[PDB]
Symmetry: C4
Subunit: 76 residues, 4 copies
């Protein structure tokens, strides 16, 4: 299926994925298309920060859903 | 099977692939041989920009076929 | 299962893994979450430097276990 | 099984591999241990340059064998 990933600016990425794909898989896809490494990526859906090892279906992300992509900064 | 990947300059990458490999697989092989990240890679065949999720058979890429590899720049 | 990875400062990383995951798999997950390339990671558990090709179960790393992550130099 | 990788300097890398691993698999393991990207790696055994897609058993590389790791430079 197809999903969308948008930065807050509105720049849209289109990804082909499977419901069983993990959030990490999506992150690697964003890296493939955008050069943005996974550790710099925070993905948000339904107001929730998406966890790497959990799947798209787990979060009920469906055909043509849109995730937001947010930059993840260093802490300590 | 074997395929070729050429920059517009003529420089040739020879790859060992399967028809079920995806375009992303091929990009990864190109990274493996040339150090060029997938996100900087645009592959072209039959006039068409090749999509990461599609397979070589999907685009009728057969043995000894040549893809063109082109630099993808930052935009929006 | 869940495991923790901590630097010597105490900074804590939480990872979802399988007992059949290799030590290299774990380093790949650390890279995923922290951007530290596997070659720069040394992982230690039970005093032992952890070998890449061995599994978590090979080392009897169980759930809620903690590993130490240390910087590996040239 | 265990194999050894050495530069022409003696520095010895010890790898755990399977006879069905590809040469690319080995380069990936070298990257994991040393940070050397696969494209910068030329591996040599029995006087030949090893091909990414071929397997360790394909080259008759057995346990406790030693491969040579050689720098690959930019060319054309
Ligand atoms: Cl290849
Ligand atoms: Cl647990
Ligand atoms: Cl190894």
């Amino acid at each position: 299926m197809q999903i969308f990933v948008k930065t807050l600016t509105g720049k849209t990425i289109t990804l082909e994925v499977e419901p069983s794909d993990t959030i990490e898989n999506v992150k690697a896809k964003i890296q493939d298309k955008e050069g943005i490494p996974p550790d710099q990526q925070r993905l948000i859906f339904a107001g929730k920060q998406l966890e790497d090892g959990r799947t798209l279906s787990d979060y009920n992300i469906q055909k043509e859903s849109t995730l937001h992509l947010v930059l993840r900064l260093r802490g300590g």
